[PDB]
Design a binder for these strands. Structure first.
Lengths: 96, 198, 210, 88, 99, 135, 22
RNA sequence: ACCGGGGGCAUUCGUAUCAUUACGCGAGAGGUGAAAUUCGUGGACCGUAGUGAGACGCCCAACAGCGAAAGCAUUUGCCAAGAAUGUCUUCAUUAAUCAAGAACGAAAGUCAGAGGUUCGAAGGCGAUUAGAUACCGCCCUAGUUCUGACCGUAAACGAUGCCAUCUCGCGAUUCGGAGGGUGCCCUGCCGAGGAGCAUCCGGAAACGAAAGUCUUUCGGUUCCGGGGGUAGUAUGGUUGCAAAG
RNA sequence: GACAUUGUGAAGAGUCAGACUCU
RNA sequence: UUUUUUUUUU
């Protein structure tokens, strides 16, 4: 729980990522998404869509313990993030 | 004319190809796009309509059915709710506590909605202006403004008349008084400010 | 004489106890719609384990509830258990920590029993320290151990076996021997046992009981 | 500059209706004219439409809430009780 | 003039101590300040133990005991003579008196 | 009138002895406690209210109770001592010992003695003021 | 309960003085 | 396997008090120095078994612990925080005390909404008395309880400001550590607490291991006093709904 | 309150000599 | 259980 915050911070500082539903979908389609993180207030339809995409692409989905406001705060941004895709763990152990 | 919002809910007819719309007073927290489950096997969620027999003691409910099938008659005003006090499986009955503080026994199959009626806290803001009362009652019925009986003449009211504005007789009248006489504190068990709990 | 209307009945305890003779009760004879047997059904009698099993556990008290009447015989069944006030007051001592617990355990025949356990920290043999206190975290651990042990003992049995285990207070001794790993315990007892939920009266089962 | 020292929103009432009544009306007037964080989209876009009806400007969700507050304390406790019973 | 070094209490490392109601007067007194007495007695007075034993329905019965913890305020303790005033030097003695 | 004793059997009743500082009750019941054989109080024996709790009044009440118990065939008594309890005093009044000794002397066999004073885990506020009874 | 009563007396006097000044 | 009644929110349990239901009883019960008011054959009080409400967490419970102080004690879950100890970890003077300024702050009290068991100001009765607007007894209203706001005062006391440093012996106690023996014992063990009795010096004395190391005055710093009253009064200012600060 | 609408069974109590009365 | 007072100076 508290570990994913530190791992996400390390990814934001060193790794590569895309914040947002559209880029997450594109990254899943083109297969450069190592992990997908979803806020807990994500719309149910969007959640099911992203999980279906992740099942197709054989990628892991992590249901963050917080809504998009807190997910954005964890990402270190001043806006809301409801979905994000980590494409390169960088110097973190988020993928595992 | 109603202080509590209404919920328009759409159900599917089980016997023909049609949609049936239901208008019920909304429980607080209900939102558009929500799913309401009504029946004996529905779970304990806000907005579900379930028999009172299935609920645990202390549950708060609204739209309670006084008699099985009357379609919800109790605890319908904004912010109000009844509570499930007890069960008796042998007689298949449930004791509930009404908003007024009374306790009533109902059949365990009487349906109710889980939650309390939305719009609570309405009668906390003063109606600072008389125009607000005017608009409030223009949407309900003709019951305003209210003229005091002592301000009338003795022809139109038991309290009217006199060289001083006074009732002249005790204002507590018996229950079986006639139609034109039954004004004031009807069948009052007591009067005056309530010092203690009642 | 107002006592002329009273008929005397004989109280009979179930077969967990050696002495099945408890004592004699009384009630007005049947008159009109008031039936003596119906009136007797439901009475509660408080007896001592000294008067039931003649064992040294005189301080253990048992409540027996009458569920049936046959002729002039009132068949009773276990209703509640409690320790004696004198025993509890004697047990409570200063400079020691008192550990209390209670748990709701379900038997295999539908009886939910709340069991109240009491224990005290023991002095070591070669102890110079006047007090025998311990850390509150250890108190919590010991309390959890007692609850778990009571659950293990009760769950899986039925009312007859749990009453049989209460009669000698085997459970108390097993606690005093098992939970003492964290801190040696003394004067561990099942202070009380009460019935939260009970099944419907089964006259058939009461007969095997009597 | 701060235009009113203490009356705030109820400055529309001038010197009418009594200080205590205006003070009581102030809390609920502020509450009913405030904007609240929506629990569905997470943006501060919930506004009162009518007494008990709260609409979100962004996700267009309509919620049945309090007369002057988006959510009431009693409703919160009832929700907590239902969730607790569900968990245990 | 300060009469006692402890100011009549047993409060150290503490701000507030809950009170108890005296046994006789019912007055509220802090628990550290109240005179406490643990009394263990026979349930039956000494002069009737033989009578109860000879009337016993059992061959050998152990007569129970009464345990009472009594709390007294200073006034109702001095009046009842549970505690007495002492000389200036004897005031500092803290050992319980012989029983 | 009474039960059928088996040639030396001890017929047991229960004697609830409520010994407050204003009165004393000697109340005989069955083992269940739901039926009362006989009850006598100190006020029934003494005219003056000041002596309702007197040891002599307790003794007289116990003697009458013993006579009635013998008439009805009860010959043994399980004692149940009691004080006011609750928020009030927990010590038995002055009539308890007199009543118990009087029963024993009368001849009723004495079974188990127990104290059943109502004692709280914690209480409602006591009667007196915060300053107590100043008299 | 000798100076506290003087405080009460002066508080009553100050109440009367306030009322008169109004 | 840290320590703790430290804080918050939910939750569990316990007898007791009161009310009430069923059954038995039979005339008193209650209360006092003695009584009376009061309750009671419409069957009280007393027993046994239930039911409901609200309050409160006995015993364990201590010259014990925690917290800035006020204060803090039924079980369990969750939440954030913290002391001491350990440290061959890190930064490198970032510190002490603090006008103005700000948070918290017992009880009573005020406002609003719920609850209203117990106790209970005011009030009303019964006593006592020369009187008794009291002590005693009976019935009680606000209040006492919960939630959200106000007030900012207590013998809020250790009647002793905070930081650093030096000066005595003894054996106990709470927490952590080190070393041994079998949770307990030992180590004239090491720190940190909270104390007690051998106490130099001090003090008008009572007394104080600080209230000592001050005419041999001088480590730093904040607040306060200047014979008793008038008087924490008048007036002005400011805060508060008021009471009042 | 009485009578009629008002029917079909049980248990208790009381009257009678299988009926009646009540609850 | 009840039990209030004792002019001024010396």
């Amino acid at each position: 729980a508290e570990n994913i915050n530190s791992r996400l911070s390390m990814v934001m500082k060193t790794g590569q990522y895309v914040l947002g539903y559209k880029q997450t979908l594109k990254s899943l389609l083109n297969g450069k998404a190592k992990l997908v993180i979803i806020a807990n207030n994500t719309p149910p339809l969007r959640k099911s869509e992203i999980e279906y995409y992740a099942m197709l692409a054989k990628t892991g989905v992590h249901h963050y313990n917080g809504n998009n406001i807190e997910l954005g705060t964890a990402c270190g941004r001043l806006f809301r993030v409801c979905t994000l895709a980590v494409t390169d763990a960088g110097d973190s152990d988020i993928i595992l | 004319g109603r202080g509590a919002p209404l919920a328009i809910i759409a159900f599917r007819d089980p016997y023909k190809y049609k949609t049936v719309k239901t208008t019920v007073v909304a429980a607080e927290g209900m939102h558009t796009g929500q799913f309401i489950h009504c029946g004996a096997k529905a779970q304990i969620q806000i907005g579900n309509i379930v028999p009172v027999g299935t609920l645990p003691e202390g549950t708060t409910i609204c739209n309670v059915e006084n008699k099985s099938g009357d379609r919800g008659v109790i605890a319908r005003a904004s912010g109000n709710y009844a509570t499930v006090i007890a069960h008796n499986p042998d007689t298949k009955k449930t004791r509930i506590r009404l908003p007024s503080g009374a306790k009533k026994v109902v059949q365990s199959v009487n349906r109710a909605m889980i939650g309390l009626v939305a719009g609570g806290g309405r009668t906390d803001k003063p109606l600072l202006k008389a125009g607000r009362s005017y608009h409030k009652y223009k949407a309900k019925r003709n019951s305003w403004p209210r003229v005091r009986g002592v301000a009338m003449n003795p022809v139109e009211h038991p309290h009217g008349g006199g060289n001083h504005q006074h009732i002249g007789h005790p204002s507590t009248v018996r229950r079986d008084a006639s139609a034109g006489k039954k004004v004031g504190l009807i069948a009052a068990r007591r009067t005056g400010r309530i010092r203690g709990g009642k | 004489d107002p006592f002329s209307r009273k008929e005397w009945y004989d109280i009979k305890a179930p077969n967990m106890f050696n002495t099945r003779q408890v004592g004699k009760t009384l009630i007005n004879r049947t008159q009109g719609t008031k039936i003596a047997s119906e009136g007797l059904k439901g009475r509660v009698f408080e007896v001592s384990l000294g008067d039931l099993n003649n064992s040294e556990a005189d301080f253990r008290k048992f409540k027996l509830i009458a569920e049936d009447v046959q002729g002039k015989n009132v068949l009773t069944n276990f209703h509640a258990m409690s320790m004696t006030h004198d025993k509890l007051c004697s047990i409570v001592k200063k400079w020691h920590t008192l550990i209390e617990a209670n748990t709701a355990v379900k038997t295999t025949d539908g009886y939910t029993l709340r069991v109240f356990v009491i224990a005290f920290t023991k002095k070591s043999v070669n102890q110079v320290k006047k007090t025998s206190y311990t850390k509150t975290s250890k108190i919590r651990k010991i309390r959890s151990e007692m609850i778990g042990c009571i659950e293990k003992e009760v769950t899986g049995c039925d009312l007859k076996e749990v009453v049989s285990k209460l009669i000698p207070d085997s459970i108390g001794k097993d606690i005093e021997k098992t939970c003492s790993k964290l801190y040696p315990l003394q004067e561990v007892y099942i202070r009380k046992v009460k019935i939260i939920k009970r099944p419907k009266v089964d006259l058939g089962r009461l007969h095997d009981l009597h | 500059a701060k235009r009113t020292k203490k009356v705030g929103i109820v400055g529309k009432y001038g010197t009418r209706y009594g200080a205590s009544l205006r003070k009581m009306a102030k809390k609920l007037e502020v509450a009913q004219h405030s904007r609240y964080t929506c629990s569905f989209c997470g943006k501060e876009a919930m506004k009162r439409k009518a007494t008990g009806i709260w609409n979100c400007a962004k996700c267009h969700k309509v919620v049945a809430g309090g007369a002057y507050v988006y959510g009431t304390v009693t409703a919160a406790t009832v929700r907590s009780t239902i969730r607790r019973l569900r968990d245990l | 003039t300060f009469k006692r070094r402890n100011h009549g209490r047993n409060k150290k490392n503490r701000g507030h101590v809950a009170f108890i109601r005296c046994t006789n007067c019912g007055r509220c007194c802090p628990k550290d300040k109240a005179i406490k007495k643990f009394v263990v007695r026979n349930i039956v007075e000494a002069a009737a133990v033989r009578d109860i034993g000879d009337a016993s329905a059992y061959t050998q019965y152990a007569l129970p005991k009464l345990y009472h913890k009594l709390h007294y305020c200073i006034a109702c303790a001095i009046h009842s003579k549970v505690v007495r005033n002492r000389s200036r030097e004897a005031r500092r003695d803290r050992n319980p008196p012989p029983r | 009138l009474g039960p059928q004793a088996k040639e030396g059997e001890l017929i047991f009743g229960v004697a609830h002895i409520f010994a407050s500082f204003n009165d004393t009750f000697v109340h005989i019941t069955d083992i269940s406690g739901r039926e009362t054989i006989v009850r006598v109080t100190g006020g029934m024996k003494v005219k003056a209210d000041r002596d309702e709790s007197s040891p002599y009044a307790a003794m007289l009440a116990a003697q009458d109770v013993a006579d009635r118990c013998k008439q009805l065939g009860i010959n043994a008594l399980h004692i149940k001592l009691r004080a006011t309890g609750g928020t009030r005093t927990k010590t038995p009044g002055p009539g308890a010992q007199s009543a118990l000794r009087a029963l024993a002397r009368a001849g009723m066999k004495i079974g188990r003695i127990e104290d059943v004073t109502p004692i709280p885990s914690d209480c409602t506020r006591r009667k007196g003021g915060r300053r107590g009874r100043r008299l | 309960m000798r100076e506290k009563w003087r405080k009460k007396r002066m508080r009553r006097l100050k109440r009367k003085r306030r009322a008169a000044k109004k």
